[PDB]
Structure 1
């Protein structure tokens, strides 16, 4: 080949992230959770694995030509990841997002060479941001649409990549996996990792996670704004197939923030969705038994969240799990 050569080496920019064994007290019995740290990636997120897999398989299946624009609707880690990997592969990148999105998001995505097209309230969300991507393709037929919320390459990325890493590294510790939890944005993470884990541990519980403040998985709908950036921003996406998963876990965004704060104070600088996943995983442990082996992921680091409530004191509410959690140690770290 040659393109094949290129894709073989560019994959060294993504994956092979640390697996961490985190020990903590939960009122006040000793527990542990296993977690992948996905900050160790090209642009700092799990979405790098997904963007790379997507573009690679698309090249393999001749579904994108050289120099073709990559076009998507997002303001988060997906725009960042396709912007960077798009530029690496010689593609201009076009991102549609709403016109009230913060300066910080726009500047970071702009840094990576993408063209940003802003959509107003009146031009329709949000939902109309994904509509203009479809318009663009019909007027420029070389357009590749990642279609993150519906594209099987997304879930597959995590089946072939991070999911397999998880099964391999838990097997090297001779630990069976009793469960896995992940917040759903596109759903690619929970679906892909779940498919992989359930091939190896048929009784594993694969629980998708939503915010209690906007339970898009349990109701179907975008109910309200919440502060768990990267998860449930729109509608149960087409990729998520709830029937193939076990029961929905719900976490309050404040509880996620406090948990992420605690994580940073033990030297793990993570995003709000990571704190959510940690709480998520503990909930699942609480259903299965204190000593069950539960895995999750930390999808990004804390550096993009330095003006969010991650930086402020959160009111502790009755039902927060995080008020009864004290982190003790990183007991082990695996890197394969």
Structure 2
């Protein structure tokens, strides 16, 4: 049993499976289920929002095949947008600090994307500044992943309802998600709160950059998380609590999950799984806990995660 043939690779974005953890969680804690968002064709959760923001601008008429989009991105949003642009016939320009790995550049350029390297010392600030300059000078479309309401909406329409159908007749007691743009938590949390009125929505952020908790931004290693600010795409009213995770605990959790469960995922997934187990221990046997693994660990073979 497989999906019928589709015309376009973007048509099989979504519908990601869920796996129960067997070994890294005790039988005396709640059941922990993980949704594998790296099962998307582009390899991460950003597949959904890359498709949504392009389909939106396409439907509105802001872009049509042949046009160029620009986005300042250092992570999975660049891969997703490069993937979707090549699939839908759009030109892609991404601005990033010149500190980005050659492997990452090769991945983006493989999709035909054009890269505009910005000063490494300016980090993401210089990339945002350069994308704005190209947008005003050339009229490129800027998706703006941190302000586009299509980002949390696509999780309200697909990721959320997916989990509703996947946990048909069962009670989800806690949903947790790492906050990057916040769209995953906002979109899914909105859908889950309507069906499960007593559900707890927990946000996950780096303990070294606890901005949602009221702390100061700082350097951290939880790739995909810790933007250092509160994004407009995050609904700060959706989560009932926050779990901060350290750099090494998330790392150690990803290694344990890969070895003991056969699930090879990124560092933010280790942060998500570590927080979900802490919440599972809190709820105890008989309860149900769900989180999201945004990316695959193969994307991070040159990070200290698997070196």
TM-score with structure 1 length normalisation? 0.84
SS at structure 2 position matched to 1:125: helix
The answer for the alignment partner of 2:52 in structure 1 is: 53
Aligned with residue 190 of structure 1, among 185, 188, 213:
185
Report if the CA contact (8 A) 1:36-1:298 is conserved.
Answer: yes
SS at structure 1 position matched to 2:221: coil
Question: After superposition, where does 1:1-336 map in structure 2 within 5 Å?
Answer: 10-24=9-23, 26=25, 29=28, 31-121=30-120, 124-141=122-139, 143-171=140-168, 174-219=169-214, 221-224=216-219, 226-265=220-259, 266-311=261-306
Alpha-carbon deviation of 1:31? 4.2
- Please give the alpha-carbon distance, in whole angstroms, between the structure 2 residues aligned to 1:157 and 1:247: 23
Report if the CA contact (8 A) 2:15-2:162 is conserved.
Answer: yes
Which range moves more in the overlay, 243-252 or 72-81?
Answer: 243-252
Alpha-carbon deviation of 1:75? 1.6
Q: Are the structure 2 counterparts of residues 159 and 8 from structure 1 closer, same or farther at C-alpha, using a change threshold of 3 Å?
A: farther
Report if the CA contact (8 A) 1:24-1:31 is conserved.
Answer: no
SS at structure 2 position matched to 1:245: coil
Which range moves more in the overlay, 30-39 or 272-281?
Answer: 30-39
TM-score with structure 2 length normalisation? 0.91
Q: Which runs of 4+ in 1 moved over 4 A?
A: 7-11, 25-28
Q: Are the structure 2 counterparts of residues 267 and 127 from structure 1 closer, same or farther at C-alpha, using a change threshold of 3 Å?
A: same
Q: Are the structure 2 counterparts of residues 30 and 287 from structure 1 closer, same or farther at C-alpha, using a change threshold of 3 Å?
A: closer
Report if the CA contact (8 A) 1:260-1:272 is conserved.
Answer: yes
- Please give the alpha-carbon distance, in whole angstroms, between the structure 2 residues aligned to 1:25 and 1:45: 23
- Please give the alpha-carbon distance, in whole angstroms, between the structure 1 residues aligned to 2:68 and 2:248: 39
Alpha-carbon deviation of 1:12? 2.7
> Which consecutive residues of structure 2, in runs of 5 or more, have no partner in the other structure?
1-5
Q: Are the structure 2 counterparts of residues 121 and 16 from structure 1 closer, same or farther at C-alpha, using a change threshold of 3 Å?
A: closer
After superposition, the CA RMSD in angstroms is: 2.0
> Which consecutive residues of structure 1, in runs of 5 or more, have no partner in the other structure?
1-6, 313-336
Report if the CA contact (8 A) 2:28-2:281 is conserved.
Answer: no
Q: Are the structure 2 counterparts of residues 73 and 27 from structure 1 closer, same or farther at C-alpha, using a change threshold of 3 Å?
A: same
Report if the CA contact (8 A) 1:281-1:294 is conserved.
Answer: yes
- Please give the alpha-carbon distance, in whole angstroms, between the structure 1 residues aligned to 2:192 and 2:25: 26
Report if the CA contact (8 A) 2:44-2:295 is conserved.
Answer: yes
- Please give the alpha-carbon distance, in whole angstroms, between the structure 2 residues aligned to 1:310 and 1:51: 26
